[PDB]
Design a protein around this ligand. Structure first.
Ligand SMILES: [Fe+3]
Ligand SMILES: [Fe+3]
Ligand SMILES: [Fe+3]
Ligand SMILES: [Fe+3]
Ligand SMILES: [Fe+3]
Ligand SMILES: [Fe+3]
Ligand SMILES: [Fe+3]
Ligand SMILES: [Fe+3]
Ligand SMILES: [Fe+3]
Ligand SMILES: [Fe+3]
Ligand SMILES: [Fe+3]
Ligand SMILES: [Fe+3]
Ligand SMILES: [O]
Ligand SMILES: [O]
Ligand SMILES: [O]
Lengths: 175, 176, 175, 175
């Protein structure tokens, strides 16, 4: 929009998200310190700030975009994390003596790249129509009840809990 | 540490990562409504990952995790800056440009942050005065774990029902 | 009304509910024992048993009754708890020298008594029509964004987050 | 053992477990019906019932057993579900003409089978010492921060967020 409110909403979206994080950590510390009600108040306040940022976020994007656009924005944001920000952050820390901090910025840098690879893989499934369909028969699992359906395609409706198509994912047994 | 560009950078990555946590929460929400439960769970999974990344930079800027007595003080000052300065400037900045409803929302949020500080200073007052688990007045206490009710000036040392300590006791009110 | 399936359905709801409680304690014990993945497996299994019990519950109740019917049912089973079951269970524990746990059963008995009073008070609020209306000017709180409103009635729509009247409650400030 | 209190606590574990599931369903319906606070109060009461049933559970089981016993007890429970419990109701519902809900009991029966052999797979990982240590080069994921580590054994402490091995699991990428 090129308007001062546009930059204000960006500054308002930040900080409001920083307040959410700060109050989530304070809730965990207050519980360890022996204050359960204070912990709940920190977390109810953390949820209040979560909803304030949603107002500014929905104004900067004219509502809430669809999952295809959301995956495209997240993949571009995570790519910026490990190619620009966390990279440049590590060099400036090493030029000042913060070796240890620089090594931490790079372990987090390696994680954001795995976030983009995951995000691009999910976006490719929507564009290729392979979200609920495989080129070879697989094992599907229902996130609602756990019903297993072997098939080249996912069921339209789960035959147990009657939940729709969205609740089916490729079952993994990583143990 | 302080005065360096690393602080600028250490403070910056705290943002963005905190900003990424909310997007992925909104993105996870929009995913269920679009018909993608796994993509919803993956978005939320990534959000909590970014939640812990920001904790690393937050503890570096605060020399670890401060105690609760300081946490309530910093939270009170953080919300004080919100309603006396931050959201007050954008209220008039948005009104002098035509967005009357955007400033009205910012003014409504400004009043909410004011109640956030008043709530925080009252909780910090209860710790510094020693009135978090004891009143000079006979009050009705409730155990947040099991629901045991206890009448008296002091909260029970241990809940006699579920054997939970004094922390799970708050001052009970019924608001309906 | 008198089929073995009705008992089977009634009995299946009990067993699935016990397993949901069993796996929530197992998840906490595993997370303390040093197994986050095993703790996570215990958690989603309990959610599966929660959905299995939901299938049998909706059959015995012919769908899902509304909140007014659910409140009358919640207050009924709660009255049966502290006037019949836990009272009979306590006197039988004392007849076997189990005085330590008979005091616990009576401690839980008093809690279920308070839960009945909470449930009747809410149902009375729906009947008389004082959920979002009060005879005095009260202070309303938006459970989504935190907006505070003064007056006899809650706002039809929150003027901050634009959420309906359903998110409003009397502010307690219990500290 | 052999006393009426054994049967009473075991009847108290049920019902208390059934009330938590009932109040969980009532909370979801209350939010749809337009009563967020009532939905919160239903949810708050459901957590109270969970801790009441926890008291009766730890009395019957003499405290909280180890994860080894918890996996053995849980696997022995799901086997009962599909070899005896649901196997009986499935044929009892068909003799009375309830074919619509007999297919659901058979579908749930197959799920409890997968629950059993998934529990024994975790148990075998503890008995063989193969929870965090594999004879093959595996890819591990930190369930707290998302750090990836390829290795035969999980990293004693995560080198990014400094969390213990508990938060480490085998990564399977089911998409
Ligand atoms: Fe805010
Ligand atoms: Fe990121
Ligand atoms: Fe299902
Ligand atoms: Fe990150
Ligand atoms: Fe704030
Ligand atoms: Fe208690
Ligand atoms: Fe089940
Ligand atoms: Fe009860
Ligand atoms: Fe609101
Ligand atoms: Fe109870
Ligand atoms: Fe089961
Ligand atoms: Fe980690
Ligand atoms: O905030
Ligand atoms: O179950
Ligand atoms: O109960």
């Amino acid at each position: 929009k090129g308007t001062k409110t546009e930059k204000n909403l960006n500054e308002a979206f930040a900080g409001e998200s920083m307040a959410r994080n700060k109050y989530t950590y304070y809730a965990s510390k207050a519980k360890k310190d022996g204050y359960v009600q204070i912990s709940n108040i920190f977390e109810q306040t953390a949820n209040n700030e979560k909803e304030h940022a949603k107002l500014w976020f929905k104004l900067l994007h004219d509502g809430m975009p669809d999952t295809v656009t959301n995956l495209k924005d997240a993949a571009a944001g995570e790519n910026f994390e490990w190619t620009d920000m966390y990279a440049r952050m590590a060099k400036e820390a090493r030029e000042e003596g913060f070796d240890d901090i620089a090594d931490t910025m790079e372990g987090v840098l390696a994680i954001e790249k795995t976030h983009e690879q995951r995000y691009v893989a999910l976006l490719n499934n929507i564009e290729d129509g392979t979200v609920f369909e495989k080129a070879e028969e697989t094992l599907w699992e229902c996130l609602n009840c756990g019903h297993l359906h072997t098939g080249k395609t996912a069921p339209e409706v789960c035959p147990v809990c009657n939940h729709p198509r969205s609740y089916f994912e490729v079952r993994k047994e990583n143990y």
